[PDB]
Structures are given as structure tokens and as C-alpha cells.
Amino acid sequence: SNTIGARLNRVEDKVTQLDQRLALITD
Amino acid sequence: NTIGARLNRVEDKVTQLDQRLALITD
Amino acid sequence: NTIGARLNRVEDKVTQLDQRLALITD
């Protein structure tokens, strides 16, 4: 669960979530 | 996609997010 | 830099964006 690839999965999901929050803030 | 491709992808997306937030605040 | 360093950096940038955005919206 701590390889580059595993940690990449988690950061990808968080980025997706942040992109959605930012959509509520601006274009 | 491959780990290499996905790492480039996220790095550039994070930059994009930062640029979009910056246009509004900071 | 190395793949590990790049991932550490992107994680770092994401934490920072997360905290800023969390002040603005849930």
C-alpha cells in the first residue's frame, strides 16, 4: 500500500475531489 | 495508463488547479 | 528529479491545495 503506484492512486483520487471543489468556486 | 504517464498527468493537473484558484485568490 | 521525489512534491502540493480549498467549501 506504500509503493509509488499505491500512493499515486490516492493522490489521483484526492486531485479528482479537489477539482470538484474548485468547480464550486470558479470556472 | 502507465505509472509514468499518470505521474505527469497529476503533476500538470495540480498545476492547473493552482492556476485556477490563483486567478480568484492569493 | 527521481520518481519518489516527484511524488513527494505532488503530494505536498495537494495537501496545500486541500487546506486552502477546505476553508472555502466543504
Side-chain angles (χ1 to χ4, degrees):
Chain A
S1 15
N2 294 131
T3 50
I4 295 293
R7 281 169 64 197
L8 181 56
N9 286 334
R10 305 191 279 272
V11 75
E12 282 178 326
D13 288 347
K14 181 47 157 206
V15 170
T16 295
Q17 285 143 32
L18 291 187
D19 183 44
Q20 292 182 311
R21 288 194 211 153
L22 198 51
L24 297 187
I25 296 158
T26 199
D27 206 20
Chain B
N1 231 354
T2 59
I3 293 171
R6 297 197 283 124
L7 186 51
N8 276 40
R9 180 169 336 165
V10 74
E11 280 173 332
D12 278 9
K13 183 49 77 155
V14 171
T15 300
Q16 190 185 85
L17 290 182
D18 285 336
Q19 292 187 5
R20 298 179 46 202
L21 179 52
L23 179 56
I24 307 300
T25 186
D26 264 38
Chain C
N1 21 44
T2 60
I3 182 157
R6 282 171 63 195
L7 178 56
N8 301 334
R9 181 177 337 122
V10 69
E11 284 185 351
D12 284 9
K13 283 176 187 167
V14 171
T15 289
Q16 176 172 47
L17 272 166
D18 179 29
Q19 190 267 341
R20 290 185 271 167
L21 292 168
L23 298 177
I24 303 176
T25 169
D26 302 328

